[PDB]
Symmetry: D5
Subunit: 91 residues, 10 copies
C-alpha cells in the first residue's frame, strides 16, 4: 500500500507506515461503530458495538503512544495540545 517502492524507503519510514495505517484503521472503526450503534435498535447488538468501539479507542491510543516514543515531532506537538484547557488555537 506504499505510495513509493519499498527499495526507496528506509526501515523507519516503513515501520511508521505500519503503525500509522493501524492507527487509521482503528480510528475508522471508532467512527463506524458509533454510527451503527446510534442507528441500531436491537439492544444486544448495541451493547456489543459500543463495547468494541471503546476497545478500538484503546488500541488507537496504544498505537499512538508507540509512535510518540519514536517520533520527536509527535512528542513535541502532543505536549503542546493534549490535556489542556485554553482554547485550542491559543496554545
Amino acid at each position: 500500500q506504499l505510495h513509493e517502492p519499498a527499495e526507496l524507503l528506509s526501515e523507519e519510514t516503513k515501520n511508521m507506515h505500519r503503525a500509522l495505517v493501524t492507527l487509521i484503521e482503528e480510528l475508522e472503526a471508532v467512527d463506524w461503530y458509533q454510527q451503527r450503534a446510534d442507528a441500531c435498535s436491537e439492544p444486544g447488538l448495541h451493547d456489543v458495538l459500543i463495547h468494541n468501539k471503546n476497545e478500538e479507542v484503546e488500541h488507537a491510543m496504544m498505537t499512538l503512544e508507540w509512535i510518540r516514543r519514536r517520533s520527536p515531532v509527535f512528542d513535541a506537538h502532543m505536549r503542546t495540545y493534549l490535556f489542556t484547557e485554553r482554547p485550542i488555537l491559543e496554545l
Copy 2:
C-alpha cells in the same frame, strides 16, 4: 461519507465523525509525505515535505485534543497510555 441516515445519528456523533475523518486525513498526510520525502531525489522538495509533514502532525494533535475534551472514552485511554515508559502492553 456517513454510513447511516443523519436523522438517526446524534449531533455529537456527527460532529465526532467530522473530527475523526479530519484526524484520519491528517495522519494519512504524515505517512505519505514521509514516503515521498524518502524517495525524493531533490533536496529542495525534501525540506518542504518534511516541514509540512510536521505541521500535519500538529494539526492531528489539535484535532485529537478536541476529541478528548468531548469523549470520556478517549480521555480515559489517553490518560492510561500517553507519555508513559513501561512496555505498552503492561499498561
Copy 3:
C-alpha cells in the same frame, strides 16, 4: 454501503447488514494485523499488533454469536460444522 434503498429493506436486513459488515471489518483487521506483524522490524510494534489482533478475533466471535441468536440459517450451519473433527466436506 447498502446496495438497495433503505425504504425497501426490513430492519432485520439493516440490522444484519450492520452486524455483518462489523464482523467483516474485524476479520479484515485479523488478516492485516498478522501481515504487518510478520513484516514488522521493531519487536515492540510486533507485540502490540499480535495482542490487538487477538482482541479483534474476540470482537469477531462476539459479533458472530449475536448473528447466530438472530439468524436461524446461521444457527443451523454453525451446528453442522463448528467444533468438529473429520474432513469438512464429509460433514455436508
Copy 4:
C-alpha cells in the same frame, strides 16, 4: 490483496489470508443476497436469492471451521461466546 511483500510473510499467514478473505466474501454475499431478496418482488427470483443466501452461510461456516482448527486464538474465543444464552458482554 496482500499488504506486505510475499517474501516477508510465513506460509501460515498467507494461507490464513486466503481463508479469511474467502470468509469475508462469503459473508458479503449473505448481506447482498438478503438485500436483493427484500427489494425483489418476483417470488421466483426472491426464492433463488434466499436459497443461495443460505448456501453462502454454509460456505462461510465451513471456512470458519477450517480457521478454528489451525488457530488457537479463534478456538479459545469461539469456545467462550458461540452457543451461549447470557448477555454477550457477560461471557468475557
Copy 5:
C-alpha cells in the same frame, strides 16, 4: 449500484439489474475461488474452495435460466451458441 434514478426505470429493468449483478457476483466467485485454490498449499482448504466454486457455478446457471425465461433476446442467442461444436464465430 444503479446508474439511473429509480423513478425512471421500469420494474422489469430493476429486477433484471438484480438478476444480472447476482450472476456477475457468482461468476466473480468462480474466478476467485479457483485462483486461491491454485495458490493455497493446504489440501483441506483446497478441497473446500473447489467445492464452493462448483456450487457458485450452479447458482450462476440458476440465475441465467431465470433471465432466459424472462428475456427473448437471451433465449435466441443462447439457442444459437450454447451446446454446439463449430468454431464460435462461425455460428453467426
Copy 6:
C-alpha cells in the same frame, strides 16, 4: 485484477479468468444499457442503446460457450438448468 501472484496460478486458471471477466463486463453492459435506454428521453439514443444492448448479450453467450467447452462443471450444470420449465429450485 488478479487475486494471486501470476507464478502461482496455472495457465488454465489465468485464461479462465480472462474469459470470466469478459463475460462479466458484457453482462454489466447489458444492465447499464437497459437502464440508460429506460431513462433516455431521445428516440435515436434510445434506439442505439437497445441495439447495442442486444449485441452485448450475443458477446456474452459467445464467451459462455467457450467456457462451457473447457469446464465440465459449467457443462454439467448448464444441462441441468438451462432450457427447462419446472420451478428452478425443483431442478437438481
Copy 7:
C-alpha cells in the same frame, strides 16, 4: 454517476451525460479486450476477443456520431482534425 443534483442540470446535459458515459465504457472495452487478446494463450479465445473488440469500436463511433449531431463544438473540432494527413498539431 452525476456529480450534481439532477434538478440543477438541463435535460440536454443529462442526455449528453448518458451518451458520453456510454462512449467511455465502449472505449474502455476496446482497450481491455485488446489487452486480453495479447496476453491470451488459447487461439479460440483470442479471436472471440478481437471480434468483439471490433464491434465495440463500432458501437463507440455510433455513439460519437449521435453526439456530433447535437453538439456544434464536437462538430467543429471533428471537422478540423478527423480524416486528415498533416501533423496533428499543424491543424
Copy 8:
C-alpha cells in the same frame, strides 16, 4: 492501470492504451465541466468551465485522429458513421 502484466502486451497495445485512456479522461472532462457549469451559481466561473470544456473536446478529437491513423478498425467504423445524416442504425 493496465489489466495484464506489461510483459505480455505488445508496445502497440500499450500505445493504444495510452491514447484511449487520454481520450476517456478528456471525454470525462467534457461531461463533468458541463455539469458544474449548469449547476454553477457564478457566471464568471461558468464561462471558464464552458470555454475549457470546448478545448477538452478539441483535445479529444486530436487524440481520436491519432487513433484513427493507427487503427484500421477505427478508420473503417469512423468512415461508416461519422458526418452522416440518416438514422444511425440504417448505416
Copy 9:
C-alpha cells in the same frame, strides 16, 4: 462528491468545491500526460500529449486565478510564496 449534504453548505463553499475539483482534475491530467509522453515511443502521440498537457496547465492556472479572486487566504499565501527566489522555507 460533496462530503456533506448540500443543504448544510453555503453557496460560496459549493462553488469553491466546483472550482477546486476542476483544478484538481487538471493537475491530475498534467501529471498523467507527462508520464505517458515519457513512456510513449510514437512521435505523433508524444507531441499531442505534451501540447495538451500544457493547455491543462493553462486551464489550471485560470481556475486558480478565479479562486484567488474569491479567497483572501489564497491571495495572502500566494503573495508570500509565488514568484520568489529565497529558499521556500525562508519565506515564512
Copy 10:
C-alpha cells in the same frame, strides 16, 4: 501510483509527480475542511477546521512555487493569469 514504469520516466517527471500529488492532496484538504466547517455545529471545531484549512492553502502554494521554479510551462501560464484584474478569458 505511477501509471508507467519508473525506468522509462525521467527523474524530473517522477519528482514532479510527487509534487503534483502533494499539491492535489493539499487542495483536497482545502475543499473538505470548508465543507466540514460549514456543516459543523460546534464553534470550537469550526475554528480549528478553518485555521488548519488555511495552513493547507499555505502548503499548496509552497508546493506550487517549487513546481513553478522547475516547470517552464507552469511559470509561463502563471505569469499570464495570476494577480490579474480583467476577465480571465480575455488574458488568453
